[PDB]
Amino acid sequence: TVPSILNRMQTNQTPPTYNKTNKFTHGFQNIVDAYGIGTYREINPAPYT
Amino acid sequence: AHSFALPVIIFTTFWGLIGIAGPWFVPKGPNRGVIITMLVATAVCCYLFWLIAILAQLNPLFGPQLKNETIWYVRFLW
Amino acid sequence: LCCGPKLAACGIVLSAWGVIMLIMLGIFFNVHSLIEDVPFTEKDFENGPQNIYNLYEQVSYNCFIAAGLYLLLGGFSFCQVRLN
């Protein structure tokens, strides 16, 4: 039972782009990703796609 | 015979309520943001396309060119 | 005959689509006795609009005949998939 504490660091490297998708929206996100992965905190075009 | 005003009233109300009132009646689940986006985008895209189709047919400059047998058939059909 | 269930399945889809299209088309010809306006009219056309109605009735009958063949095709193809 080690405390196992995960502590946030001054994030300062480029983080990955995580878009939550489901059974419906995943396909639309992929055809967007096919062109490229959006900038961190970029406006996701998929909800309009 | 048709007027233009009435089509506009009926379809503008139809698509308006969908894009305007629709978002008011949405579940609180994780898809709420997606459902609202779709409701509005759909109503705007569909309404605009139709509105173009109907407006483009106002104040026509010319009518159709029909074949003689076609012209006859219509005379005794409509 | 088996013929392969992949091809019998295709026949079922073609047969179902055909029956739907042929019935609907035959109705349209019978109602507007029309947009298609291709019933193969005579060149010696007289002042008898009833002649055009009669032509469409013939076209409609032919449409239902074709549908009947698709109904028979769907039946056969159906049993092939069930047996395969």
Domain extent, residue C51, equals 1-84
Token duo for residue A8 = 């946030």
Q: Which residues of C44-65 are buried (b: 16+ CB within 10 A; e: fewer)?
A: eeeeeeeebeebbeebbeebee
Q: Please indicate whether, in this complex, the C-beta atoms of B69 and C34 are within 8 angstroms of each other.
A: no
From the CA of A47, how many Å to the nearest CA of chain B? 6
- How far apart CA A1 and CA C70 sit, in angstroms, is 72
Chain B positions touching A20 (Cβ under 8 A) are: 30
Q: Does B41 touch chain A (CB under 8 A)?
A: yes
Helices (H) and strands (E) in chain A, counts: 1, 0
Q: Does B60 touch chain A (CB under 8 A)?
A: no
Token duo for residue A28 = 């639309």
Token duo for residue C75 = 């039946």
What angle do the packed helices C5-31 and C50-83 form, to 10 degrees?
160
**In a 10 Å sphere around its CB, with 0-12 CB exposed, 13-18 middle and 19+ buried, how is residue C8 labelled?**
buried
- In SS3 terms, chain B reads as CCCCHHHHHHHHHHHHHHHHCHHHCCCCCCCHHHHHHHHHHHHHHHHHHHHHHHHCCCCCCCCCCCCHHHHHHHHCCC
| Contacts with B50 (C-beta within 8 Å, 6 or more apart), sequence order | B11
Of A28, A31, A24, nearest to B29 by C-alpha is A24
Q: Please indicate whether, in this complex, the C-beta atoms of B69 and C32 are within 8 angstroms of each other.
A: no
- How far apart CA C54 and CA B24 sit, in angstroms, is 56
CA distances C78 to A1, C12, C16, C17, C81, Å, are 64, 6, 11, 14, 5
The closest CB to that of B41, out of A20, A24, A48, belongs to A48
User: How does DSSP classify residue A8?
Assistant: -
Q: Where are the alpha helices (DSSP H) in chain A?
A: 25-33
Number of folded domains in chain C? Answer: 1
Q: Using an 8 Å Cβ cutoff, are C81 and C15 in contact?
A: no
Q: Using an 8 Å Cβ cutoff, are C16 and C57 in contact?
A: no
Chain C positions touching B69 (Cβ under 8 A) are: 37, 41, 45
Among B34, B36, B39, most A C-beta atoms within 10 A, so best to mutate, is: B34
Q: Using an 8 Å Cβ cutoff, are C13 and C74 in contact?
A: no
Among C30, C46, C52, most B C-beta atoms within 10 A, so best to mutate, is: C52
Token duo for residue B35 = 């459902």
Indicate the resolution in Å: 3.9
Q: Please indicate whether, in this complex, the C-beta atoms of B77 and C41 are within 8 angstroms of each other.
A: no
Residue count of chain B, please give it. 78
- How far apart CA A23 and CA B65 sit, in angstroms, is 51
